[PDB]
Design a protein around this ligand. Structure first.
Ligand SMILES: COc1ccccc1Nc1ncnc(Nc2ccccc2S(=O)(=O)C(C)C)n1
Ligand SMILES: COc1ccccc1Nc1ncnc(Nc2ccccc2S(=O)(=O)C(C)C)n1
Lengths: 482, 476
């Protein structure tokens, strides 16, 4: 049963129909209701009951074929399934022979059916055709479920995954509902959605580089939407956001894709508490909107293993990064976190605990590194915030009001993975180090109000809410090498 | 009045505030009401009426400044109230009244604690007891060039119509998303980069995969694979890229909407387009008739009527009923190409680059058809297959398709067709993944694309695409 032979026979079948005067790709079929409408309008009749008086025009993809005068098929459309019972008695022989009409049908063929609704003797909700027409033939062989488990066919040919595995469709439906909820959530709080250029002249992480033929200039794909949105705040759009793709030309892994979907907003006059409350409201309400409860289960170590429970009931713990690193390492990090003595202490903590060195070893990255190992996995039963990051890790963040060297920064984590970043912006142009992007400093001189900004990782959030371990399982067409 | 000096004086003023114990960029202000809420909650208040027992914390930007009685205009979220600073209502224990208000300049962001009222002249206003600077505008704000494009925040602060233009843009996209969702369409995202991408593409180097990728020019191919996948109504709104020449109606980065609709036919796509444009314009204007300065703000405007239905003109038939010249079936024949060139030559019409049969028919349609109906939208229909190799063949007219293209004032704004789903008629199958997916079964399907930027230009009465994009790209 070579797949190259099945295709060649089906290909010969198609030309045979054309020679015999039959179009296997007809122009138009006049559907009257969809399968989900069908299921909802006739699910509650009796076992074996027929309403032979109403005629309907249904479409769908034949998904399983079973065989003399009785023939059964499965019919799928818009994610839902009904049975097709082909009975010799109801067949309209003016249109053709019963046997050859249904013998030509293979699993995967898309068909139009003119029939009446009913329920089977065993009791299965079914459509009772009088005529069936091939609309589009499936020339290749569709696998069963097992074929798309360990192979990366799910990613190369995502349409096979969406036809064969029911979980795949639900995943990507949940993805769309997540984004719909985010947009409606933001819009109800008076936020204004905008579009910002994806190419600019100036652009942490390596950029994607491209050239514009017209202006003979090299351009950069955006790594974030921060700068243009802050200029709109100056412009008087006091609550503004954008949902869209950003690009970081770095290495692929399970939680990093070079092209990924970000939402960022800026909120004029928001303080740290406003941002904390927004995050807790958003996540707790999003999870309730999807699941009817605040508690979900997530297979933190794959489906081969027992899942853990994550509770999204607010409030969530807040952990101060510097104070907590000191707590679990019995160390006192100094006042200048970039001081040679303070660096030295941080570097020595890495070796004693045996941690991947962060060379280029920088105060920021070691701080990051320590947090990675010492704090970022502190809780897994519930989301939590790491807060009050030092000003040396957060050059754009307003300085903490009562603690020296710190900011009003917050980062929300789920199962050890960053999902949200937010802080109050440094708006004094005389205290921003960089201004001493050049458009940003000029925009600051026109007056930026006290302002809070927040960014969300849409792909990672969808990952946890659909119980997936890889970012590739929530992107329809993850980019790959041919 | 050197602008460098005004800046230098105000920056010296800032450092003078700090050296005085006053922070001109304080940490936070506890705003309790926005200006639009204030305008709405107290709109129905009598002249000279005050509510002195109600304390409010309001913010905004001073846009106008005019000894013991100070008057200011305060704007926020696009709306304005007046600030009436009376010596008697100031809290003198916080500072000298004159010292506080003499520092205020146009463009300053201020936080105010005070009570609401209307002036004896009727103007709705806030009466401060305390006014605090929240962020200084160190530069001189111009009163009402290409500065509007680079520093768009200046455009949004000084021109009221600019904010309205971009509010309408967001409103248009919102209406389209809701219009699609109510009909059962499902929004998705497809890659911005791909291995195969006519039009010149943008090229970029992927570091991790050591590959050179192409920025998408359309969303058509991945969306069609989703129809195969059983997502029968699907769409995407996002950016597509054409590495080509900038024009008043062409931007290399522009916003597209494409949907695919399994089992839709020509009539469905006609009716979708006619319902969408008419209902959208009515939703925005309360009428189907708008005015548009097609010839610039100097010249007089025309009226575009969006009352459906719109006329439909068959491209090949009409080009002969005006050129009186039959175009032989193989439109790409050397003979047919030469005859089309001859019409173009005899009418002093510019030969397109390159001189291909699809290009020539485009030129002939532009000059003999596309500007016939300009007081309402219209469709050009039944384009030859040579122009739309992905479209399905016309049911009865050989060599044609069932494609529809909608024009407004001579600019294309919408393109739709039923899809060629027989893989044995796809000449392009000699993009590799798409031919394979056609062999799994693509049902009969309608596709449709929308030019969001062009639509926004007509509905906000702009002649240039740069006026409907917040930050149009430009050389520095
Ligand atoms: C080569 O890929 C990359 C290289 C470098 C950065 C990102 C990516 N791609 C990627 N893909 C999916 N999710 C994320 N999220 C993320 C990543 C880093 C820091 C914070 C977050 S986040 O989720 O808190 C949100 C607030 C952005 N990044
Ligand atoms: C250098 O810029 C370009 C180079 C080449 C192509 C496009 C652009 N940019 C651009 N900018 C704004 N609107 C459009 N739309 C458009 C353009 C041409 C024909 C039809 C349409 S359309 O609106 O019917 C839509 C359904 C495609 N294209």
């Amino acid at each position: 049963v070579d797949p190259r032979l099945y295709f060649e026979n089906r290909s010969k079948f198609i030309q045979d129909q054309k020679d015999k005067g039959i179009n296997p790709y007809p122009h138009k079929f006049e559907r009257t209701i969809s399968i989900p409408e069908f299921i909802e309008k006739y699910k509650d009749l009796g076992n074996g009951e027929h309403l032979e008086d109403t005629i309907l025009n249904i479409t769908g993809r034949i998904m399983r074929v079973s065989a003399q005068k009785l023939r059964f098929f499965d019919l799928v459309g818009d994610g839902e399934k009904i049975q097709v019972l082909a009975n010799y008695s109801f067949h309209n022989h003016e249109k053709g022979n019963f046997a050859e009409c249904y013998d030509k049908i293979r699993r995967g063929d898309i068909v139009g059916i003119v029939g009446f609704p009913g329920k089977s003797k065993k009791g299965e909700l079914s459509i009772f055709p009088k005529e069936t027409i091939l609309l589009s033939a499936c020339l290749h062989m569709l696998p069963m479920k097992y074929g798309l488990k360990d192979t990366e066919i799910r990613y190369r040919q995502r349409y096979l995954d969406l036809l064969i595995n029911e979980s795949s469709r639900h995943t990507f439906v949940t993805r769309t509902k997540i984004i719909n909820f985010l947009r409606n959530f933001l819009n109800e709080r008076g936020f204004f959605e905008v579009e910002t250029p994806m190419m600019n002249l100036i652009a942490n992480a390596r950029p994607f580089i491209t050239h514009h033929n017209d202006l003979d200039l090299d351009l950069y794909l955006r790594i974030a939407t921060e700068l243009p949105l802050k200029m709109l705040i100056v412009g008087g759009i006091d609550k503004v956001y954008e949902i869209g793709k950003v690009f970081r030309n770095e290495g692929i892994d399970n939680t990093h894709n070079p092209e990924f979907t970000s939402c960022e907003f800026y909120w004029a006059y928001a303080d740290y508490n406003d941002l904390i409350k927004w995050s807790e409201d958003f996540f707790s309400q999003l999870v309730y909107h999807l699941f009817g409860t605040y508690k979900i289960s997530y297979n933190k170590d794959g489906p081969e293993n027992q899942p853990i429970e994550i509770d999204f009931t607010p409030p969530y713990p807040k952990v101060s990064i510097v104070e907590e690193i000191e707590k679990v390492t019995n160390t006192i990090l100094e006042q200048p976190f970039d001081s040679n003595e303070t660096i030295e202490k941080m570097i020595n903590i890495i070796k004693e605990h045996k941690i991947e060195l962060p060379n280029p070893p920088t105060a920021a990255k070691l701080l990051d590194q320590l947090a990675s190992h010492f704090i970022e996995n502190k809780y897994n039963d519930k989301p939590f915030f790491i807060v009050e990051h030092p000003q040396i890790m957060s050059p754009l963040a307003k300085y903490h009001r009562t603690k020296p060297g710190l900011t009003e920064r917050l980062e929300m984590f789920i199962c050890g993975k960053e999902v949200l970043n937010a802080y109050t912006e440094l708006n004094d142009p005389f205290k921003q180090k960089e201004c001493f992007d050049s458009a940003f400093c000029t925009s600051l001189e026109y007056g930026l109000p006290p302002t809070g900004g927040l960014g969300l990782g849409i792909d990672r959030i969808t990952m946890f809410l659909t119980n997936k371990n890889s970012i590739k399982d929530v992107i329809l067409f993850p980019t790959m090498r041919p």
